[PDB]
Design a protein around this ligand. Structure first.
Ligand SMILES: NC(=[NH2+])NCCC[C@H](N)C(=O)O
Length: 232
């Protein structure tokens, strides 16, 4: 009957809280489409990002849609079905335009702002000489920079490309990741002991891709490289 998708709505444009108090975004739109393919009614529930895997494992939720990067370590705990993105080999470092080059390396700073429980936080914490401050939300991370409280932050590029549009005084610099910290694109999480749901859900994703629904949705939430609309 009900299909519970766990998420952490802290994370534009995948899932976040709008001006009205409503949870919206690319993942939410996808969860809606998928639940329709599944014959089930969608319910979205909020958890801390780091709590999602355990809830899923325990079947306190039925799936995860949380912009969750595919990594081997996560794959040991659950299934992650590819639905967006490609390999990530770099990160953005955000700073005020006023901050003098070189922005790199990150060891030069009093702190570096980053979102909690994320692979990019774990990268920073494994590097020598980085003082990390971690926050609930992407906005908090960026506000920490524009408010002068951290000289720099780190975002994922797919996220940074979208969010930084609204901050004309911030600038972003590529920071290549060591190949041992490259991750894959985003996967929809399903418990590993549920193969039947895996297949069903995999088939819903392939169907939405075929139908052009996933392309529409990636455009709608600015997750695709922008194309021109050409009259033919
Ligand atoms: N809804 C969220 N808070 N998502 C955070 C995902 C960040 C990054 N893609 C990771 O998987 O570690």
């Amino acid at each position: 009957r009900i299909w519970i998708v766990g998420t952490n709505a802290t994370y534009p444009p995948f899932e976040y809280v709008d001006a009205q108090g409503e949870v919206v975004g690319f993942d939410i739109d996808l969860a809606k489409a998928i639940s329709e393919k599944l014959g089930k009614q969608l319910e979205v529930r909020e958890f801390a990002f780091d709590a999602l895997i355990l809830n899923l494992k325990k079947h306190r939720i039925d799936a995860i849609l949380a912009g969750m990067s595919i990594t081997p370590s996560r794959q040991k705990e659950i299934a992650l079905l590819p639905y967006y993105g490609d390999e990530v080999q770099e990160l953005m470092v955000v700073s005020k335009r006023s901050l003098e080059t070189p922005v790199l390396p990150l060891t030069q700073y009093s702190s570096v702002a980053v979102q909690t429980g994320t692979y990019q936080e774990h990268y920073l914490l494994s590097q020598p000489g980085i003082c990390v401050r971690s926050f609930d939300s992407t906005l908090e991370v960026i506000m920490e920079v524009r408010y002068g409280k951290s000289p720099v932050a780190v975002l994922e590029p797919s996220v940074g490309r979208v969010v930084l549009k609204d901050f004309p005084n911030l600038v972003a610099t590529r920071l290549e990741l060591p190949p041992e910290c490259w991750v894959l694109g985003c996967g929809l999480g399903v418990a590993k002991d549920r193969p039947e749901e895996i297949q069903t859900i995999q088939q819903a994703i392939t169907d939405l891709k075929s139908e052009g629904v996933i392309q529409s949705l990636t455009k709608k939430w600015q997750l695709s490289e922008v194309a021109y609309e050409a009259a033919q």
